[PDB]
């Protein structure tokens, strides 16, 4: 995401291809979400 | 992290020194972790 920027849509670009843009913030918050799930178990003890 | 970028390793560039890299994402997730700290003694009570 930091290497590119979002503009327009996919229709206005001639020759555009489909791929999966890697979000650098997605796994960091997902791994932190798994850390929260470990801390959520401490709410019962 | 926004003022630098990760490239290569520490064994290539000559004269490299050891230090810590402050990540702006760390305190935001730490403050939220400390915001959750008050919730442990809540549910258990």
Number of helices of chain A: 1
- Label the structural class of chain A: mainly alpha
Strand content of chain A: under 5%
Distance between the termini of chain A: 40 Å
What's the shape of chain A?
rod-shaped
Largest interface: A-B, 9 and 9 residues
Helix content of chain A: 25-40%
Multimer state:
part of a larger assembly
What features would you describe in this structure?
This is part of a larger assembly, with two copies of chain A (45 residues). The first copy, chain A, has one helix spanning 25-40. Chain A is mainly α. The first copy, chain A, is rod-shaped. Chain A binds chain B through residues 25, 28, 32, 36, 39, 42-45, and chain B through 25, 29, 33, 36, 39-40, 42-44. Chains A, B: Glycans are attached at residues 18, 42. Chains A, B: This is Spike protein S2'.
Give a brief outline of the structure.
The structure is cut from a larger assembly and holds 2 copies of chain A (45 residues). Chain A is an all-alpha fold and 45 residues long. Chain A contains 1 helix and no strands.
Features:
part of a larger assembly; 2 chains; 45 residues; mainly alpha; 0% strand
Summarize the SSE layout with pairings.
The structure is cut from a larger assembly and holds two copies of chain A (45 residues).
Chain A: H1 25-40
Protein name (chains A, B): Spike protein S2'
Organism (chains A, B): Severe acute respiratory syndrome coronavirus 2
Glycosylation sites (chains A, B): 18, 42
